[PDB]
Amino acid sequence: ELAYVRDGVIQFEVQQPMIARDGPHPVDQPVHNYMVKRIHKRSLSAAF
Amino acid sequence: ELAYVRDGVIQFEVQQPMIARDGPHPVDQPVHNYMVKRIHKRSLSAAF
Amino acid sequence: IAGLFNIPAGIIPTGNVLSTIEVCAHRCIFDFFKQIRSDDNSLYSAQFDILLGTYCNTLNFVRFLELGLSVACICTKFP
Amino acid sequence: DNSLYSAQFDILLGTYCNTLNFVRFLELGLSVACICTKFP
Amino acid sequence: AIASEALSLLSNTYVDGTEIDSSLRIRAIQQMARNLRTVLDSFERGTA
Amino acid sequence: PFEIEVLLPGELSPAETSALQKCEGKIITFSTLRHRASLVDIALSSYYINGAPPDTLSLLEAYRMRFAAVITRVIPGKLLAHAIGVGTPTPGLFIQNTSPVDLCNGDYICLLPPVFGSADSIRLDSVGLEIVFPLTIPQTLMREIIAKVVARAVERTDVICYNGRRYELETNLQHRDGSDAAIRTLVLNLMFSINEGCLLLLALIPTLLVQGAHDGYVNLLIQTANCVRETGQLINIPPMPRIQDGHRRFPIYETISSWISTSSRLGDTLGTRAILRVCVFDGPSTVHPGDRTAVIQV
Amino acid sequence: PFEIEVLLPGELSPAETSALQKCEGKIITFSTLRHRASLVDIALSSYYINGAPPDTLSLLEAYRMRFAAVITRVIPGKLLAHAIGVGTPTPGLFIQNTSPVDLCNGDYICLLPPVFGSADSIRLDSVGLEIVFPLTIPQTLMREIIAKVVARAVERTAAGAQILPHEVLRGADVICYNGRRYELETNLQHRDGSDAAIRTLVLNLMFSINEGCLLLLALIPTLLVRFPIYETISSWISTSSRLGDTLGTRAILRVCVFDGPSTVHPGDRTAVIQV
Amino acid sequence: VTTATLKRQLLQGILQIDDTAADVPVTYGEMVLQGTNLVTALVMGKAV
Amino acid sequence: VTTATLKRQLLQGILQIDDTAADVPVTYGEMVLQGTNLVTALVMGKAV
């Protein structure tokens, strides 16, 4: 059943590590990212 | 859990009868219509 | 901008990408790129709709003989 | 009539995430460049 | 009146057995029954 | 039954798909007929002549050259449509009214570009094109619109009363290649309606003016006309010549027949031709704008 | 297949019933299609406009807007008919020749109001209505028939308008088809339909044509070696276009004869195919 | 719902009283989302 | 993926062949929605 579903979605997640450095630099924070993605549709045909 | 409600709705259906007749008139056919409505939220407060 | 389902949507994952690299560089690849600094808001608000039921009519019928008008004529069948 | 017979819907094809690793100073080869110790 | 997809679903003559159209066939039969039960009473009503 | 399948482009936004589902019984045009086609042909971009959007006089020529098709049930992926021009049986055909004017039973349908206010048309931003649907009026209203548009064309190089309601037209003539072409086909019809028999019919003006009075009906014929009313009291019309071979020939026969074929060709070459006839079974006698009717192929 | 049933009226004289039995394969023209109809739609009463009986110019416009049908069989209490309309696959479609000219195979059928002579028709004095049947002529002869009838009427006006008539002529007009001549309207007297039904037809034809080779002569004076000047053009285009749609020629049937006589005379019936 | 003045004016001679006691429910009819409702409201954003 | 000409030009002396045969899965791997997935997409229109 693929012709009925419309606007399917997929989503990911990634967290980046961080480094502890001090001095004349602003303090850092952890990282958490969030992303999604949609679908596309294509068909094939033949004759007889 | 009313603090977390985003636009609840209610719908309902109703159908009409059908009368049969002849002469120089177009013939009838049963009709079905559907209706839907939203909700309204309001708060109350008091002091102490 | 799809964002249909919840973005964190904490559930059982089905694997792991390693990729050991920044993703912020490649920005024009994903449909929505949401980047929180660290534990921001919009991660705990559970908004949802709710259906509170449906209704319908009955539409009773009527026969010609139960009507009081039937005492105005003598009806019969004729194939 | 085609007014209420549509059954279109959206679906979610699962999710994905990742896990990071942790490094320690002593497992690197730079630990043989100095002698570190703890002084509370 | 009867619709094209309804008549197509009904004229399958056991070429199916999935789980999605098992509901569409039921709903088409229910719609037909609902329409016929009123079309019949239309004549009893138009007599008067 | 011949049908053509328009493959809708993928990745379409849900809002545009719903708007496309609104266009159930409208009419589209094709340059070349084929079972499988693309959306570029239906788009207005295909109507371009040199490099620009077309003109109302150029549109009248694209309508004759292009084939005609009627939209039918549209599904999310495909867009079904049936052909009209070629002889092909189509049971239960229907059209959606797009003109502001009402239609009734037994009216012939024509096809003209949108001359009234800005044409209501679906616009696609992601694909980048837009499709304009032609406008459908009856025959009587068609001949009146063409007459005023051509007259305005000669002016460069309006109000129409229908059912007691007045309308206006914003004709567009930003081009010149097509305007002079209509002048050519016009004078060529007037030039071919002149034979040896005009002299007799041009000599019957005085008795026509006499018949105009004490008839109460020819006056309306005289008031609408301007030339014969002016020439009737300004020219002498030398009496009569003879016939070369009057013993076996009928000279007034050609002119009364030569004009018949010319007038019939006039209504079609100037604008468009009748495409359909509306005849609804078990329906209302008069349709309102936006509603659909069952029509028969001409 | 779509068929129309015409309800026969009660208390009908046997003479009128027998005459209705005769017109088996004749053409009826219906205003609005419906499985059940009344005789009022068939009678001439439904055809007339503005109170007065209909005109030839009006009848020509009637035949276009109005839908046609064909009688199939009559019944002592019922009357049936079939349509030549949308898609009906009518089997065994036969018609009866109503025109004085003969027909052959591969000839397309058109319609025409009765112009040559007095139209024959059934008249029902008991009910008080009459039913007029249209004429069925081939296509090639239709365009010539109209041009000859109108040209005949203008000749009469000229002979009356001109102080002296230009009588010198070729004799009598005649339409020839399949080696058969029709020699219509021999006598000058008996002006039955001279100006009775084609009166307004000649008038509208005598004005548009007069505007034809006059507007050109008043616009380009090079041909022969206060004033609108544009509303006259728009009015001429609107009229000449409408008049052309009136005097149109659209075939309705095709005479396809199998295992039968090729040529057929007025009064015979042949199987025809729906074009 | 009226004012006491109109109430007295109606009850004096216009209307007739039927009863001086009635039976009133004392329930509030509580409902709360639970079961699969929670799991379909958390991940999808809809509930029934 | 490349043309056979470049394939031969790479296989002559540029690259070294490791193996001539390999182990490939023989089944496609299908999925069909069942159970609680057939009831939520009908009323709400969201499946997982």
DSSP G207-273: HHHHHHHHHTTTT-TTS-----SSHHHHHHHHHHHHHHHHT-----EEE---SS-SSB-TT-EEEEE
Give residue F276's Cα distance to chain centre: 12
CA distance H18 to I26: 84
Does B30 sit within 8 Å of E39, measured CB to CB? yes
Residues of chain C positioned with their CB less than 8 A from the CB of E44: 61-64
Say whether A1 and I33 touch across the interface (CB within 8 A): yes
CB F163 within 8 A of CB F173: no
For residues F257 and F193, give the distance between their C-alpha atoms in angstroms, rounded to a whole number. Answer: 10
Spell out the residues 6+ positions from residue D12 whose beta carbon is closer than 8 angstroms to its own.
A8, A9, A10, A11, C4, C5, C9, H43, I46, I47, I48
- Alpha carbon distance A29, A19 (integer Å): 9
Cβ–Cβ under 8 Å, residues G13 and G72: no
The tokens 């039913």 sit on which residue?
A: G131
- Rounded to the nearest 5°, which phi and psi values hold at C42? 60, 25
Read off the amino acid at residue D18. N
Q: Please name every residue paired with F5 in a beta bridge, in sequence order, or none if there are none.
A: F36, F80
Q: How large is the C-alpha radius of gyration of chain A?
A: 22
One-letter amino acid of F217: Y
Answer whether B19 sits within 8 Å of E35, measured CB to CB.
Answer: no
Q: Write b or e for each residue in C54-66: b if 16 or more Cβ atoms lie within 10 A of its Cβ, otherwise e.
A: eeeeeeeeeeeee
Amino acid at G119: A
At G68, is the secondary structure helix, strand, or coil? strand
Three-state SS at G82: strand
Å between I39 CA and nearest CA of chain D: 11
Q: Which residues, 6 or more positions from G120, have their beta carbon under 8 angstroms from its beta carbon?
A: G133
In this complex, which chains have at least 3 CB pairs below 8 Å with chain A?
C, D, F, I
Q: Where are the beta strands (DSSP E) in B1-48?
A: 9-15, 32-38
> What residues of chain E lie within 8 A of the CB of D1, using their CB?
1, 3
Q: Which two tokens stand for residue G80?
A: 């049936």
F185: which 2 tokens?
A: 């086909």
Cα distance between residue F195 and residue F255, in whole Å: 6
Helix (H, G, I), strand (E, B) or coil at F70: strand
Token pair 């039954």 is found at: F1
**Distance, CA of B44 to chain centre:** 28
Round to whole Å and give the CA distance between A5 and I41. Answer: 9
CA distance G40 to B24: 13
User: Quick check: C13 and D12 CB within 8 A?
Assistant: no
Q: Which residues of chain D have a CB within 8 Å of the CB of E27? A: 5
Q: What is the residue type of B46?
A: A
Which residue matches tokens 């300004």? F234
Method for this entry: cryo-EM
Q: What is the rounded CA–CA span in Å between residue G87 and residue F298?
A: 11
Alpha-carbon distances, residue G257 vs G84, G95, G111, G274 (angstroms): 18, 12, 20, 13
Would you call B20 and E38 a contact, using CB atoms and an 8 Å cutoff? no
CA-CA distance, G107 to B43, in Å (whole number)? Answer: 86
Say if CB F264 and CB G248 are below 8 A apart: yes
